[model samples]
Target: SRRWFHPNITGVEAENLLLTRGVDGSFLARPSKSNPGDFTLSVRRNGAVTHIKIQNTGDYYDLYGGEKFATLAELVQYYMEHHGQLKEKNGDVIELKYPLNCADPTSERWFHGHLSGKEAEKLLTEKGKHGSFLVRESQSHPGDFVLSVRTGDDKGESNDGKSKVTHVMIRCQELKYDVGGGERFDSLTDLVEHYKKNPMVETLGTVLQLKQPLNTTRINAAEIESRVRELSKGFWEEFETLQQQECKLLYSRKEGQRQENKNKNRYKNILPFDHTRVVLHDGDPNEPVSDYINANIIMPEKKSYIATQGCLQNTVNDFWRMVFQENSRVIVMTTKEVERGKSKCVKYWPDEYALKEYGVMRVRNVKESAAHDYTLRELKLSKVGQGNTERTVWQYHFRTWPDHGVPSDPGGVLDFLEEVHHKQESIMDAGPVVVHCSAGIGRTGTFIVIDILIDIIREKGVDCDIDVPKTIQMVRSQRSGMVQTEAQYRFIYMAVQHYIETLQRRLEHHH
Candidate 1:
């Protein structure tokens, strides 16, 4: 028999989902006045910080409805019992530790979200609030921020109206507007005009439109991936246009027939001069910074952070594109880089999770491909397995970012993919994405290239106009030569050949 009381809960399952450990080597407990743990923990999940502190104040339940605080020992036991499980939550916010397992997928790290101070509680005071939402920094940093309300919580977010938001800072302004210039309508050319060139509007409607119960539409995941690849490949004709632009324009004087024969200059390698930042050998035109061309590999289903929704990382991928490509603009803010009215920046989205193990649940590192399966209803993946995911013919499910802190080393792209997926999640149904790093050239190209190559293998080809090398070069052309380094170039060549060995086994049973 079982009995549960508000603000006072004790159970094996309750303890497991409430608290765990923090990077500072302290015990991470839940938000409760009665049962206080040793340390207060701030874990990032879904997309917000699940701020779990042992509050002695009376508003403990107001802060966390019915969450129980657990000691470090209790949390470890719960982890030992159900490590990597997608521990659930029913608060204004939810939390997930790294290497999460929900429906049997082992996330690389955790994802959590909490109320911004006790005030974030009001956003979720009602159920089903539906309005547009945005995640950005105040003063151009990750700390000061704004979220939206008038939208329902944990349901599909449609452009229609509904109102319910918990743990999000709904801002003051809400608008729907369109922008662009010339053939570059809604283009990065226009986007750069704002963030890079002009500053009329310090912010863009990052979440241009949305709705509650945005409505859910599902497809066979594999089939969806296949269609994505097919569409990317089908754009070959456009690829050809980019390739010809890549062709150098020359003057023979002998033929005098508007001649172009030699690759006399490096810039010539990137032709159609209008193509900005392309390297004449990298990047994809279908992405955000198409001209900053470097390498490309569309990971068909690679995944960021935020509210409850399909895949958080996918939402981020779209965010990046809208900011860079569609000019919907993403305002960057940093925890440290704050200076009001600028932009928002995080070293990387997932870095927030792994850099601090910032979640309420315990983290587990599943280090082998075989162990990449289910264990007691939880899923798993290893660091090495992530490396393998990156080494695929085309993109499978990993993106590699430079370990800038470790200079000349590969960072946790695998871990990044998993965490970010939950961070930018639309809170409503959305789609998947192809995320990248640095100038959107090298890292970005690698993502698309791998995605495309694997797409081609099963009768998948770039399908349209392709001078593959030229496709990449355009990325560099656009972003002032972003993917020129030899190391960055090689990544694309190597990844473009990775195959999908795991596709057949992506899930135990396809829903």
Candidate 2:
């Protein structure tokens, strides 16, 4: 079995990352003299005109400086962050990336710490034994249990004659301290029982009902397309009904009416779902993070993502604050700051100045490089009181995708999504990769579902039996109105099929 090994990448991969960022630099990796199977990185900085040997510090990599990084991307991000600063003669110490120990409210739903005899017993008896759903220890992320629905019976070679699986979103944060703000429990019955117990609680948990499960069984590529096509009709029917009750104002306004409507949303059409919107920790009564951001979980794992409407000029500061709070390393912006002759999203990053202040933080645009499909900007984020301390943030602005439609080249979008996946691997499970489009659901959901489906396909194998509609259904469960139009839903099938083709070519080449 082939896998992306740690350091995650080899010297060639490291060099590719540097070149991709347009940092005219190279790398060297050699055996550690003192140990077996360990390696060190000879990182060269073009701006410094010299190189540094970042030693293998067992658990992490060290740059001779006190700071250590978990992965190669962090190491390079640090090197470039300071390399640019040193060239400009700014001798301040850069703030390193923050800790990823923030609370995940989804932990309560995970099989790890949350599962006990009572919950496990109830889960099996209530839903597991019948047929549609299976509750057992998670195969992907062990120590935790997973309650998965059998999307299809894939009697295929690669699947080892097993059923294709898709899991559901279980809960939302209800307690005062819960970061996942919305509404409780394991299954539909459990959700109802909890609500019955509470009685007075108006909003319950953010659980999903999969109206029509997608059939993932496929004997060939043509079968894959046929199943996806079958699922699309019902998916669009489901989408139309779900799309109407989208945006709503939380705080009541009075011109004797809903006067605060516009203020309540980042965009009229792109509001976050109320049940799972990201509620800010500290804010004035009406001014909260609840405005336009929703939390979406990527399933069977604790990877929690924040999907929000693109930044309003007013909400840019809040965006940074969320990044700081959540300990996110990668930000995937699917829409351009402006698109179709209108401002689809605000220019959140500094354009004219190397360093610009936004709210409480100063953002230094360290380097900007253009790719065929996307533009990459490596930025340094620092707070006022933190002095020279700062952290590295990668802003990946995917340019080709348009509003209310799919990109002309699905392959190009898949290629960019692969780049995003590599960047994600570099982070090594730090936090959710913050994703946004204008409303944060359509293209944002499109990008995320693709990222997720590709991973599943790779892990399970092409013959592993995948249901695009089921996958999209899982995503919509986390946040409402995902994969916006019928066109986007169809695009997912096209994207996944393209990705599988590419994956086969690579595996064939690897062989």
RMSD of 1: 29.1
Q: lDDT for model 2, on a 0 to 1 scale?
A: 0.52
Q: State residue 418's C-alpha deviation in candidate 2, in Å.
A: 0.9
Give every collision pair in model 2.
95-389, 95-390, 111-145, 184-205
Q: For residue 367, give model 2's deviation from the true position in Å.
A: 0.4
In candidate 2, what are the lDDT values of residues 295-333, reduced to their tens digit? 443442235567766777677777887777677878888
Q: Candidate 1's residue-wise lDDT over 162-274, tens digit each?
A: 44442232222222111332222232122222332332221533332333221111223334444335545433222222222322222112211112322221111221122
Off by over 4 Å in 2: 1-264, 268-270, 284-302
In model 1, which range of ten residues has the least summed lDDT?
103-112
